[PDB]
Design a protein around this motif. Structure first.
Motif, PDB file in Angstrom:
ATOM      1  N   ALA A 129       0.820  -1.206   0.000  1.00 58.38           N
ATOM      2  CA  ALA A 129       0.000   0.000   0.000  1.00 58.38           C
ATOM      3  C   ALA A 129       0.853   1.256   0.000  1.00 58.38           C
ATOM      4  O   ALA A 129       0.509   2.267  -0.630  1.00 58.38           O
ATOM      5  CB  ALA A 129      -0.948  -0.006   1.220  1.00 58.38           C
ATOM      6  N   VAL A 143       2.864 -12.014  -0.631  1.00 60.22           N
ATOM      7  CA  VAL A 143       1.492 -12.522  -0.716  1.00 60.22           C
ATOM      8  C   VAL A 143       1.347 -13.332  -2.008  1.00 60.22           C
ATOM      9  O   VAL A 143       2.350 -13.759  -2.582  1.00 60.22           O
ATOM     10  CB  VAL A 143       0.468 -11.373  -0.647  1.00 60.22           C
ATOM     11  CG1 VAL A 143       0.567 -10.673   0.718  1.00 60.22           C
ATOM     12  CG2 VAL A 143       0.687 -10.339  -1.797  1.00 60.22           C
ATOM     13  N   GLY A 144       0.120 -13.583  -2.446  1.00 57.12           N
ATOM     14  CA  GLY A 144      -0.090 -14.320  -3.683  1.00 57.12           C
ATOM     15  C   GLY A 144       0.262 -13.525  -4.946  1.00 57.12           C
ATOM     16  O   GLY A 144       1.033 -14.014  -5.789  1.00 57.12           O
ATOM     17  N   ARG A 175      -5.386 -22.749  -7.086  1.00 59.15           N
ATOM     18  CA  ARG A 175      -4.722 -21.557  -6.552  1.00 59.15           C
ATOM     19  C   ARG A 175      -4.386 -20.527  -7.651  1.00 59.15           C
ATOM     20  O   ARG A 175      -4.607 -19.324  -7.494  1.00 59.15           O
ATOM     21  CB  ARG A 175      -3.447 -21.963  -5.806  1.00 59.15           C
ATOM     22  CG  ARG A 175      -2.600 -20.785  -5.323  1.00 59.15           C
ATOM     23  CD  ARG A 175      -3.291 -19.977  -4.218  1.00 59.15           C
ATOM     24  NE  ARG A 175      -2.444 -18.866  -3.778  1.00 59.15           N
ATOM     25  CZ  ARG A 175      -2.802 -17.965  -2.869  1.00 59.15           C
ATOM     26  NH1 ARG A 175      -4.005 -18.044  -2.307  1.00 59.15           N
ATOM     27  NH2 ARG A 175      -1.965 -16.990  -2.523  1.00 59.15           N
ATOM     28  N   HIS A 216      -9.651  -7.246 -10.638  1.00 66.16           N
ATOM     29  CA  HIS A 216      -9.254  -5.943 -10.105  1.00 66.16           C
ATOM     30  C   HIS A 216      -9.275  -4.855 -11.189  1.00 66.16           C
ATOM     31  O   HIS A 216      -9.461  -3.675 -10.878  1.00 66.16           O
ATOM     32  CB  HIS A 216      -7.851  -6.004  -9.492  1.00 66.16           C
ATOM     33  CG  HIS A 216      -7.830  -6.202  -8.003  1.00 66.16           C
ATOM     34  ND1 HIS A 216      -8.615  -5.472  -7.139  1.00 66.16           N
ATOM     35  CD2 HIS A 216      -7.078  -7.020  -7.227  1.00 66.16           C
ATOM     36  CE1 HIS A 216      -8.378  -5.856  -5.892  1.00 66.16           C
ATOM     37  NE2 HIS A 216      -7.446  -6.793  -5.920  1.00 66.16           N
ATOM     38  N   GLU A 225     -11.267  -5.111  -2.291  1.00 69.85           N
ATOM     39  CA  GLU A 225     -10.810  -6.480  -1.992  1.00 69.85           C
ATOM     40  C   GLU A 225     -11.972  -7.452  -1.759  1.00 69.85           C
ATOM     41  O   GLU A 225     -12.000  -8.512  -2.357  1.00 69.85           O
ATOM     42  CB  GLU A 225      -9.848  -6.495  -0.799  1.00 69.85           C
ATOM     43  CG  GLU A 225      -8.514  -5.773  -1.082  1.00 69.85           C
ATOM     44  CD  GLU A 225      -7.809  -6.245  -2.389  1.00 69.85           C
ATOM     45  OE1 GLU A 225      -8.045  -7.378  -2.853  1.00 69.85           O
ATOM     46  OE2 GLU A 225      -6.996  -5.480  -2.936  1.00 69.85           O
ATOM     47  N   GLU A 242       0.168  -2.366   6.429  1.00 71.16           N
ATOM     48  CA  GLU A 242       0.439  -3.746   6.077  1.00 71.16           C
ATOM     49  C   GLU A 242      -0.433  -4.678   6.944  1.00 71.16           C
ATOM     50  O   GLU A 242      -0.808  -5.769   6.503  1.00 71.16           O
ATOM     51  CB  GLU A 242       1.946  -4.029   6.203  1.00 71.16           C
ATOM     52  CG  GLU A 242       2.807  -2.922   5.530  1.00 71.16           C
ATOM     53  CD  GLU A 242       4.262  -3.311   5.295  1.00 71.16           C
ATOM     54  OE1 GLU A 242       4.793  -4.170   6.031  1.00 71.16           O
ATOM     55  OE2 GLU A 242       4.891  -2.748   4.375  1.00 71.16           O
ATOM     56  N   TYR A 260      -4.530  -5.812   5.718  1.00 75.89           N
ATOM     57  CA  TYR A 260      -4.900  -6.813   4.704  1.00 75.89           C
ATOM     58  C   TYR A 260      -5.248  -8.150   5.341  1.00 75.89           C
ATOM     59  O   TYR A 260      -4.451  -9.099   5.350  1.00 75.89           O
ATOM     60  CB  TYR A 260      -3.775  -6.954   3.668  1.00 75.89           C
ATOM     61  CG  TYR A 260      -3.682  -5.693   2.825  1.00 75.89           C
ATOM     62  CD1 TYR A 260      -3.141  -4.525   3.358  1.00 75.89           C
ATOM     63  CD2 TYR A 260      -4.189  -5.651   1.535  1.00 75.89           C
ATOM     64  CE1 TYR A 260      -3.084  -3.340   2.612  1.00 75.89           C
ATOM     65  CE2 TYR A 260      -4.130  -4.463   0.774  1.00 75.89           C
ATOM     66  CZ  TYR A 260      -3.581  -3.317   1.331  1.00 75.89           C
ATOM     67  OH  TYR A 260      -3.518  -2.130   0.620  1.00 75.89           O
TER      68      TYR A 260
HETATM   69  C1  4SY Z   1       3.493  -4.660   1.072  1.00 79.23           C
HETATM   70  N1  4SY Z   1       2.061  -4.974   1.062  1.00 79.23           N
HETATM   71  C2  4SY Z   1       1.466  -5.915   0.242  1.00 79.23           C
HETATM   72  C3  4SY Z   1       0.097  -5.921   0.524  1.00 79.23           C
HETATM   73  C4  4SY Z   1      -0.889  -6.853  -0.188  1.00 79.23           C
HETATM   74  C5  4SY Z   1      -1.664  -7.734   0.564  1.00 79.23           C
HETATM   75  C6  4SY Z   1      -2.525  -8.597  -0.098  1.00 79.23           C
HETATM   76  C7  4SY Z   1      -2.593  -8.571  -1.488  1.00 79.23           C
HETATM   77  C8  4SY Z   1      -3.530  -9.537  -2.169  1.00 79.23           C
HETATM   78  N2  4SY Z   1      -2.727 -10.594  -2.733  1.00 79.23           N
HETATM   79  C9  4SY Z   1      -3.229 -11.833  -2.889  1.00 79.23           C
HETATM   80  O1  4SY Z   1      -2.619 -12.660  -3.577  1.00 79.23           O
HETATM   81  O2  4SY Z   1      -4.618 -11.985  -2.615  1.00 79.23           O
HETATM   82  C10 4SY Z   1      -5.353 -13.185  -3.026  1.00 79.23           C
HETATM   83  C11 4SY Z   1      -4.706 -14.491  -2.426  1.00 79.23           C
HETATM   84  C12 4SY Z   1      -5.460 -13.298  -4.507  1.00 79.23           C
HETATM   85  C13 4SY Z   1      -6.789 -13.011  -2.447  1.00 79.23           C
HETATM   86  C14 4SY Z   1      -4.374  -8.875  -3.226  1.00 79.23           C
HETATM   87  O3  4SY Z   1      -5.360  -8.202  -2.917  1.00 79.23           O
HETATM   88  N3  4SY Z   1      -4.060  -9.036  -4.513  1.00 79.23           N
HETATM   89  O4  4SY Z   1      -4.888  -8.397  -5.515  1.00 79.23           O
HETATM   90  C15 4SY Z   1      -1.795  -7.713  -2.242  1.00 79.23           C
HETATM   91  C16 4SY Z   1      -0.937  -6.845  -1.578  1.00 79.23           C
HETATM   92  C17 4SY Z   1      -0.146  -4.991   1.535  1.00 79.23           C
HETATM   93  N4  4SY Z   1       1.077  -4.409   1.855  1.00 79.23           N
END
Ligand code: 4SY
Ligand code: MG
Ligand code: MG
Ligand code: MG
Ligand code: ZN
Length: 889
Positions: free
Chosen positions: A125, A264-265, A294, A305, A324, A377, A380
């Motif tokens: 973020a 993260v993912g 996955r 998104h 989200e 951070e 999330y």
């Molecule tokens: C340094 N930082 C990184 C984040 C962050 C946290 C979560 C995601 C999430 N990443 C993720 O793989 O979510 C799934 C498993 C697809 C639901 C996200 O919203 N991706 O769109 C993307 C970024 C917050 N701070």
């Protein structure tokens, strides 16, 4: 520690219209030159010009090409760059700077960093301020013109947002690429990638406007053969948004890039989605089955998104669930349509009611739109994402598909150019609600409580049937327990999808019906109900609540056997198990407390065991569903229902119940394990990476679940099956052979065999690590120290660390060893990790989240380790804030 409050939102006194970046990558430094074309906004009151800038080495800063001098005209404290008001222009001006950063030593994986031999950014973020100075918040929309230069041989592939508009050679064996991205965007959607990337490529033609979109998926050269499924998923995602939502992609090109080191993912950077390699890369030869769902989920998620997050953006971070929760909901719809298996929905419910319900009754409890934060951070969360998605899903349940689609389109068409709030979405849904109920007097103002109220609602039932007047009543009550966020909880708008089953023939007695519970209690009456029904409640899990169905086990068995809804069948089974578990737990607890020499346990209901047998033996029944009914509820689901949970007693309880069912059903289990082999392990499409069969994978899930049960029970000669299983081509099978061999003397033989099979694929090795970590071994502590010495070592790869330790923390009997050594071990890993990656350190705190739910000794043991962690002089803000909230300080 600065606390930001949602009520305090105010637009900036400044505007950033254009960003022009030059990012010059060198081996021991990266030079970032930035020109910001800025203006004074209408909210300006003559304040200082303050930029975010974290860890930047200043070479120079300027205003309108005039070099600024430190002390006189500005100050920098490694967090904020302050330029004193007297030196800030009153109209349009240019701010510029040149800073040095160091991706090569950036182990926190935020901002610009090096993952193996790939340079990559992560800006959501608040990572953009680690690259260059900015007013780093999502309502500062700007145009971006980005130039990247690097050594050609090491970094031949250069990527940023927008169109590549120039490529050029540079003396000294360097080259550069310029990317212009004229549409406005927030800085957290900026991205850059540099590396020796190989790709797979396709062209997608959109449904209505027939625009050609180039699709690229990238990885390091070694794993380019693992890219095919990802590309198929992307195509599938684009088609779904077109078919369900009537939405096409608006850019010329979409890149997906995998890197080995990611917190993260994945991340939805505009036209340049960046992925944890474990959520983009798979092959049938070196991935377990879970990888396919996955990748489908994460690719789908980042694609969806593009509308819900990238075209319609957030005003501020308190709106996070609006992009989200809504995007998870869209991915959930997508995946249910792609997999065509009922276990897809069941698995999301299974995860919500275990992990998110635990969070919602913990000291960390928050609504899906919080009122405050310190470290972004920590925002999330499964609450924001998964309860958020259930709140977005309820709109669809209330409205039905047609009016939901109208509402969703209202939202997109109205806000497409702009920022939005949760209120905007509700407003759009409300317009649909008015149209559906056919009066402009209808409203969804009560629905907004889903955004502001924390905690899980409890919904309970009582029933009445009058045989003579054919009249049936469902009396409903809702309650949310008070917490730190609200002392007085208010009644929510709860949609209850219901059916009425005739217990005599299993038929539906009423049409599709969604009860709208808007009060603390209501009574719903049905006429012309010919016989006393069994109610089928919250079909599809239609609200994120604790369901207290007050049904007898006999009624639950009938539903489990004859109901039409997968979730209610599964929940009925869950409820039968929970009754049994709570009863046996208390019996075991009393024997322990009273130090009984002898005592009785209540046997598992025999008619329930019979019903399991009936379903297992039904060739027409679903294999995935079958694997759910033979599994007890998750430990983290159970713990919601027990005060001062003694983990040892729960472990003894589970053992008893599993042994009870196995003593009756093991022959059935074995018979099925053998009969499922042919279809489950069919190799016909093993070398076709675009052929994914979710039913077949569920068949393997069932076999591997049955093999686990049979191995724990020491079923006669099952070790033969285990050994043959280890020779299977499917990693889901031969890694299962490792874990179920834990109960035999051949464990370390299969340990070595499977390690050999895993060691040369980075992701596969991580799955091997998970498998070892979750192995039901009495010598598991010794095993972990071997993983540390021989495989994990001092790796800073979050995938490696999470693989070694997280599965172990779910070992109920051993992680919760009464000595506290499990707690001590993980706290050591958290503190170690916190030195270089605060975000992942906080992830590693997960087992502590239930600390105040355990028996008083284990509470104390966990609290001691958390207080020890809190006392570390070098503790990050991220971890400190998390542990302070978790320990009620
Ligand atoms: C340094 N930082 C990184 C984040 C962050 C946290 C979560 C995601 C999430 N990443 C993720 O793989 O979510 C799934 C498993 C697809 C639901 C996200 O919203 N991706 O769109 C993307 C970024 C917050 N701070
Ligand atoms: Mg199509
Ligand atoms: Mg208080
Ligand atoms: Mg590695
Ligand atoms: Zn997301």
């Amino acid at each position: 520690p600065k606390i930001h409050y949602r009520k305090d939102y105010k637009p900036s006194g400044f505007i950033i219209n254009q960003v022009t970046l030059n990012i010059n990558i060198h081996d021991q430094e990266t030079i970032v030159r930035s020109v910001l074309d800025m203006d004074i906004s209408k909210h300006n009151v003559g304040e200082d010009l303050v930029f975010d800038g974290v860890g930047l080495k200043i070479n120079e800063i300027s205003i309108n090409n005039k070099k600024l001098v430190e002390g006189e005209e500005y100050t920098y404290d490694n967090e904020f760059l302050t330029i004193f008001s007297k030196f800030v222009p009153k109209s349009k001006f240019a701010f510029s700077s040149e800073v040095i950063i160091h991706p090569e030593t950036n182990y926190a994986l935020t901002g610009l960093y090096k993952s193996k031999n790939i340079i990559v950014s992560q800006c959501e973020a608040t990572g953009f301020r680690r690259i260059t100075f900015f007013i780093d918040r999502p309502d500062m929309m700007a145009k971006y013109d980005v130039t990247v230069t690097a050594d050609k041989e090491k970094y031949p592939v250069l990527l940023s947002n927008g169109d590549k508009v120039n490529e050029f050679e540079i003396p000294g064996g360097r080259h550069g690429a310029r990317f212009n991205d004229p549409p406005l965007k927030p800085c957290y959607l900026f991205a850059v990638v540099a590396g020796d990337l190989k790709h797979l490529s396709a062209t997608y033609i959109t449904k209505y406007t027939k625009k050609k979109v180039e699709l690229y998926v990238f990885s390091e050269e070694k794993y380019v053969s693992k890219l095919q499924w990802a590309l198929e998923c992307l195509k599938k995602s684009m088609a779904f948004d077109e078919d369900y939502f009537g939405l096409e992609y608006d850019l010329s090109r979409l890149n997906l890039v995998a890197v080995s080191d990611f917190n993260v993912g994945a991340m939805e950077n505009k036209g340049l989605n960046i992925f944890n390699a474990n959520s983009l890369l798979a092959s049938k030869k070196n991935s377990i089955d879970f990888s396919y769902a996955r990748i489908l989920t994460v690719v789908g998620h980042e694609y969806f998104h593009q509308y819900t997050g990238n075209r319609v953006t957030l005003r501020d971070w308190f709106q996070l669930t609006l992009k989200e929760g809504l995007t998870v909901h869209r991915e959930n719809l997508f995946s249910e349509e792609m997999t065509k298996t009922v276990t897809t929905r069941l698995s999301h419910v299974d995860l919500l009611r275990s992990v998110q319900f635990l969070e919602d009754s913990s000291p960390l409890s928050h609504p899906i739109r919080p009122e405050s934060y310190v470290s972004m951070e920590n925002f999330y969360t499964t609450t924001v994402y998964d309860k958020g998605s259930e709140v977005m899903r309820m709109y669809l349940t209330i409205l039905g598909e047609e009016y939901y689609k109208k509402g969703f389109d209202i939202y997109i068409k109205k806000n497409d150019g702009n920022t939005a709030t949760c209120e905007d979405f509700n407003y759009a849904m409300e317009q649909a609600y008015k149209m559906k109920k056919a009066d402009n007097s209808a409203n969804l103002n009560q629905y907004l409580l889903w955004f502001s109220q924390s905690g899980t609602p409890h919904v309970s039932f009582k029933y009445n049937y009058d045989a003579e007047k054919k009249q049936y009543s469902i009396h409903v009550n809702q309650y949310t327990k008070p917490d730190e966020n609200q002392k007085e909880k208010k009644p929510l708008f709860i949609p209850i999808s219901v059916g009425l089953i005739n217990p005599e023939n299993g038929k539906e007695m009423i049409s599709q019906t969604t009860l709208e519970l808007t009060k603390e209690s209501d009574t719903f009456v049905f006429n012309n109900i010919a016989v006393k029904p069994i109610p089928s409640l919250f079909r599809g899990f239609s609200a994120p609540v604790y369901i207290e169905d007050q049904l007898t086990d006999e009624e639950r068995i009938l539903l489990l056997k004859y109901d039409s809804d997968a979730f209610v069948r599964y929940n009925s089974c869950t409820n039968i198990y929970m009754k049994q578990i709570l009863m046996n737990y208390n019996e075991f607890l009393k024997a322990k407390n009273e130090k009984l020499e002898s005592f009785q346990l209540t046997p598992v209901n025999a008619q329930f065991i019979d019903a399991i047998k009936y379903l297992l033996e039904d060739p027409h029944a679903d294999a995935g569903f079958k694997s759910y009914i033979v599994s007890l509820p998750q430990d983290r689901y159970i713990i919601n229902f027990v005060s001062n949970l003694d983990t040892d007693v729960l472990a003894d309880t589970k053992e008893y119940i599993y042994k009870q069912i196995g003593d009756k059903l093991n022959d059935v289990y074995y018979k099925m394990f053998k009969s499922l082999e042919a279809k489950a392990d069919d190799l016909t499409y093993f070398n076709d990476e675009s052929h994914v069969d979710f039913d077949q994978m569920n068949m393997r899930t069932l076999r591997n679940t049955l093999l686990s049960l049979l191995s724990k029970a020491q079923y006669p000669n099952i070790l033969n099956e285990i050994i043959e299983h280890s020779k299977s081509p499917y990693p889901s099978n031969w890694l299962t052979s490792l874990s179920v061999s834990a109960y035999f003397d051949k464990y370390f033989e299969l340990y070595d065999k499977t390690y050999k099979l895993s060691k040369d694929d980075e992701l596969l090795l991580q799955e091997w690590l998970k498998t070892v970590s979750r192995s039901d071994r009495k010598d598991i502590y010794e095993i972990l120290k071997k993983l540390e010495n021989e495989v994990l070592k001092d790796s800073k790869n979050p995938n490696d660390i999470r693989a070694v330790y997280l599965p172990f923390t779910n070992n109920l009997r051993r992680f919760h060893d009464i000595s506290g050594k499990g707690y001590k071990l993980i706290a050591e890993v958290i503190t170690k990790t916190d030195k270089f990656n605060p975000m992942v350190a906080t992830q590693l705190c997960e087992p502590f989240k239930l600390w105040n739910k355990l028996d008083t000794k284990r509470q104390e043991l966990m609290l001691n380790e958390m207080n020890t962690m809190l006392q570390e002089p070098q503790i990050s803000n991220n971890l400190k804030e998390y542990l302070l909230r978790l320990t009620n300080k």
